[PDB]
Symmetry: C2
Subunit: 158 residues, 2 copies
């Protein structure tokens, strides 16, 4: 029922005018696809969905040197929970280059993560709740995506 | 659910691998915004949704000179049905400049057209059915959007 555009600058987070919940979706658009970037520290780029208390509902980290993608969750003060992994970074972004889009579907009990047209993981939730803020962490010198990512949100749906 | 990406060059159309149906959505992304494009005849740009038969489920036409976004429909060999209007084009895109996006949600009885964040019209369908074809018609000289517009679909939702 509603569309919201957010211009997330690398290293910052943002509050949503419309909360993301079951039936909703968010898509992080990047205007570049740096697959020859430096080495992550240890991450090159991260995309996250936070709960109102600050807990990471979905933490997605890309690591080129380690050539793997990380998927986890953690309460605002708690420890990183059970790690989920997927090898072959460059392979996910296949078919499309010069840019890339990452989508997260809030299926209620699971977060479907889609890179371009390819579903990379049907991530079972370790923490529930609606998402009120997103973030994009990376440094200009080593992020796989553009310095400014455009996360567009589609809410109201259900 | 699934995500589909289609690059559409001005004047062409494309078959969807996944049809847009009730509860689904499409977002055409333009890398440019030209509000001084020139004289359309009478259209500067049009975005469309067709069904197998070829019917115009929804015909979105942008017109700078006439300063109006027209919305209509029509059967295969039929005449245009009842036109709907939204005056002042530049005003709908107010908010972002170097680019723009147009989303279309299929809510069964109505098509909800949203330009960027602004919902421009609650178009009650004059013809129902599934969308098998997306289309972007314009010339490389008078289009308000970039020469190639990227259509992204969100399906399987409901």
């Amino acid at each position: 029922q509603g569309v919201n555009i957010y211009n997330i600058s690398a290293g910052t987070s943002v509050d949503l005018a419309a909360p993301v919940t079951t039936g909703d979706g968010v898509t992080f658009f990047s205007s570049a696809l740096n697959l020859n970037a430096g080495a992550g520290n240890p991450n090159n780029t991260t995309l996250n969905l936070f709960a109102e208390n600050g807990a990471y509902l979905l933490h997605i980290a890309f690591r080129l040197q380690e050539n793997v993608i990380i998927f986890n969750s953690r309460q605002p003060d708690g420890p990183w929970l059970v790690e989920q992994r997927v090898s072959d970074v460059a392979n996910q972004f296949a078919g499309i280059d010069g840019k890339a889009m990452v989508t997260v579907f809030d299926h209620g009990d699971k977060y479907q993560v889609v890179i371009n047209e390819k579903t990379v993981i049907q991530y079972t939730k370790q923490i529930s709740g609606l998402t009120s803020s997103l973030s994009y962490n990376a440094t200009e010198e080593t992020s796989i995506f553009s310095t400014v990512v455009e996360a567009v949100t589609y809410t109201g749906l259900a």
